[PDB]
A paper describes a structure:
BbvCI is composed of two protein subunits, each containing one catalytic site. Either site can be inactivated by mutation resulting in enzyme variants that nick DNA in a strand-specific manner. Earlier mutagenesis of these residues confirmed their catalytic nature and demonstrated that the site in the R1 subunit cleaves the bottom strand of the target site, while the site in the R2 subunit cleaves the top strand.
However, after derivatization with heavy atom compounds ‘I3C’ or tantalum bromide, the space group was converted to C2221, with only two subunits (one dimer) in the asymmetric unit. Initial attempts to model the density as a heterodimer of R1 and R2 subunits resulted in high values for the refinement R-factors, particularly RFree. In contrast, modeling the electron density as a homodimer comprising two copies of the R2 subunit resulted in satisfactory values for Rwork and Rfree (0.189/0.249, respectively), excellent correlation of the model to experimental electron density, and significantly improved geometric quality. Crystallization of the R2 subunit under such conditions revealed an elongated dimer with the two catalytic sites located on opposite sides. An intervening four-stranded, anti-parallel beta-sheet (residues 116–175) protrudes from this core. This interacts in a domain-swapped manner with its symmetry-mate in the opposing subunit, to form a dimer interface corresponding to an elongated beta-sheet. The molecule is saddle-shaped due to deep concave surfaces at the dimer interface, and there is no obvious region of contiguous positive surface charge that might accommodate a DNA duplex of seven or more base pairs.
Author numbering:
A (entry chain B): 9 to 274
B (entry chain A): 4 to 283
Write the structure that this text describes.
Amino acid sequence: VYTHGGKLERKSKKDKTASKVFEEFGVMEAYNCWKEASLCIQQRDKDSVLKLVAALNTYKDAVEPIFDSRLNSAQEVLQPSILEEFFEYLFSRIDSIVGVNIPIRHPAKGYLSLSFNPHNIETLIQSPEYTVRAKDHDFIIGGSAKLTIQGHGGEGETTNIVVPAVAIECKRYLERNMLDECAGTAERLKRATPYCLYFVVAEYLKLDDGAPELTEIDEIYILRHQRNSERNKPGFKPNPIDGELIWDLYQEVMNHLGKIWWDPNS
Amino acid sequence: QFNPLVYTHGGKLERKSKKDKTASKVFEEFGVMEAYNCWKEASLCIQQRDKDSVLKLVAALNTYKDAVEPIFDSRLNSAQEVLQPSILEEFFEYLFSRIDSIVGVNIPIRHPAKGYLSLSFNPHNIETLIQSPEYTVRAKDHDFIIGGSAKLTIQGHGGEGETTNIVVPAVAIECKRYLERNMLDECAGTAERLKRATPYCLYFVVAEYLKLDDGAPELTEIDEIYILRHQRNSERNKPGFKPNPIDGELIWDLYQEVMNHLGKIWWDPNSALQRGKVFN
Ligand SMILES: [Br-]
Ligand SMILES: [Br-]
Ligand SMILES: [Br-]
Ligand SMILES: [Br-]
Ligand SMILES: [Br-]
Ligand SMILES: [Br-]
């Protein structure tokens, strides 16, 4: 898939302003170097995961100052996909670890609900119209399925859905509005798929004068251990993305993906 | 199969009478099967559904309850089982047995049934999630549903469908002898769930007597609550009590509300950019 790469590739064909900037400041080259260094790491011991994090830090240090200063709102398109593409690298080896061919490992809309909204009494009997609500998540590990409804009139109406085992939101900074929105989604997500792990990953924290809502979210990671308001202050050094957190997150995901979950009895 | 007259109450008597020798003795000695047969025959024989015909169905209902409920109450008691509550259910089956031509389609469900509430996923493991993800349909028992039935199939990468029968209601009605606090709260909770699952389902709570100790006020998602006899369940206790009959005009009001609902176009995209508004 390559979420971040795909955004760059399309902006470079389509957006004259942004393609100019990409060439002049060497974004494509830096991106290529990040991908090539990331995709060649085969193992997932602690050291390998810390190598992925170093390449991630390097890429962000190279490219985020360009996104921030050289693009307008041409760049609240570019920056957020970096973490998403990162997770695709981190979890690109799960097929051989767990012995199954996992179709979803990228941003996707995970199933929330099925409800029925027939046009009329005829329709309700013959072929009831329905809605699958799904929620876009920054990163999902899951399966895809087909959902078919059939009435008396014999034809099946089918919808493709994604069922997550893991879903991760990825943000630069976590503020009040977003964290509340995440806690509401967690509630829906746990009714729909009780065995889905739900993580909110941010680099910076920005809850100011306010108290975080820790609803049904399994973990919140603040990768740089710093407050958002430090960013505009005089001579500011951003902490790197902490490799120990990503190592912790990796282990928790993998532990979850290898376990049993549900059982008619045991 | 298709069947709008399943005789829920008749079926209860018939099974009690085959299985419970004590109860079947009581049935014969006090003429319950005869009174029941008379109720069914008078109900089945009313062909129209104008106001007067609906009042006639209610009179037959009143008569049958007057005949049989004092027997259930005093001669059987806890062996009354599902006996007394099914009368109102069988009643609604009579009331709605002829809707097929008015509405233009044969309605498959018109009986107590579990209407679909939600679909959620509970895979056994990562293998199962990809191949064939296990799931749960939550559904709610209602005393009477007018609705359709559908098949829900989920399929993973390993091809084969896991199928479940569901019922999708257009109307769902709870039927009780008396309405108390616990049941009303439980009904209000179900109404919230029921409106997310099937927003175009009409939801009614019908009882004969009211038993709300508290007059504390709660808005709810129940479309109508009918107290058929307009009395309190505290009068029933008292020395020398005459029960008010089931009021025919309320049942007439309920019938008309159901029929208006079943005739309407519920979801109409083209009828929304026409008007301006989505409702009235
Ligand atoms: Br591939
Ligand atoms: Br595949
Ligand atoms: Br919902
Ligand atoms: Br018949
Ligand atoms: Br009672
Ligand atoms: Br629900």
